[PDB]
Amino acid sequence: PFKEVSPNSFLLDDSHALSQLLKKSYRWYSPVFSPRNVPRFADVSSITESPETLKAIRDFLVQRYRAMSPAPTHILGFDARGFLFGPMIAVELEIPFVLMRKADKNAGLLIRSEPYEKEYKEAAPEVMTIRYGSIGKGSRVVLIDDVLATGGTALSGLQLVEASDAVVVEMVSILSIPFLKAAEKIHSTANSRYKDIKFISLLSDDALTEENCGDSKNYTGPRVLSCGDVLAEHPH
């Protein structure tokens, strides 16, 4: 079951088989071995490449929503890591999977989000969109992405669902980074207007240790190799 770690922010109890499997499967990488400048970049591939882990996530969330009342009407996944988990859940629940993407990636008449201004050195906010009418009045939307870090896109999701005259069921993530206080900030911003938004995570990055480090030890070459270079390494 989900335990309330802070107001309206829940974490799957670590005794659960899914929590255990995630802790076992996850691999994180330091800057020199990752695409982002964060201490530990939790690779979604370590999850999607693990058949047992992917199935465990699918089974758990599907059961969750089938048991939920009133049931969700839509799953809204974030480009692109949310696309990895949303469709496999939506296909079972037999509900639409909507895509939240930047305007230059989405088709049709779109609705764009209104991110807050950045905070000195703090990365630039992304304007995200959904096609106008993809979610209608009365819709109960489940928001999904792999990692809840700063929560910028999570906020875009909330804005888009509200503007659509719909309600957010909950913001779900495979992994949360509690240190970044995304849930805390979203729950207090603009006079606690999103105080009632529920956040659920399957694993906290605090559960990840050095055993989860995917960095190549004692490696001194480049991070990226060309196919030609790799081809030369074996008889072909």
Q: Hunting for tokens 């109960």 — which residue is that?
A: 140
Site for ligand ADE in 140-169 (CB under 6 A): 147, 149
Length of the chain: 236
Chain residue at closest Cβ approach to Mg ion = 153
Residue 83 interacting with its own copies (CB under 8 A): yes
Contact 169, 142 (CB under 8 A): yes
Binding residue (CB under 8 A) for its own copies from 8, 9, 25, 106? 106
Pick between residue 144 and residue 149 the one whose CB is nearest to ligand ADE: 149
Site for its own copies in 190-209 (CB under 8 A): none
CA distance linking residue 191 with residue 168, whole number of Å: 18
Known binding residues: 40, 42, 81, 145, 147, 149-151, 153
Q: Cβ neighbours of residue 88 under 8 Å, at least 6 residues apart?
A: 54, 58
Binding residue (CB under 8 A) for its own copies from 10, 19, 22, 29? 29
Site for ligand ADE in 28-47 (CB under 6 A): 36, 38, 41-42
With H, G, I as helix, E, B as strand and everything else as coil, classify residue 2: strand
CA distance linking residue 76 with residue 72, whole number of Å: 11
CB atoms closer than 10 angstroms to residue 222: 8
Size of the site for Mg ion (CB under 5 A): 3
Which positions lie near ligand ADE, rule CB under 6 A? 36, 38, 41-42, 147, 149, 177
Which positions lie near Mg ion, rule CB under 5 A? 78, 145, 153
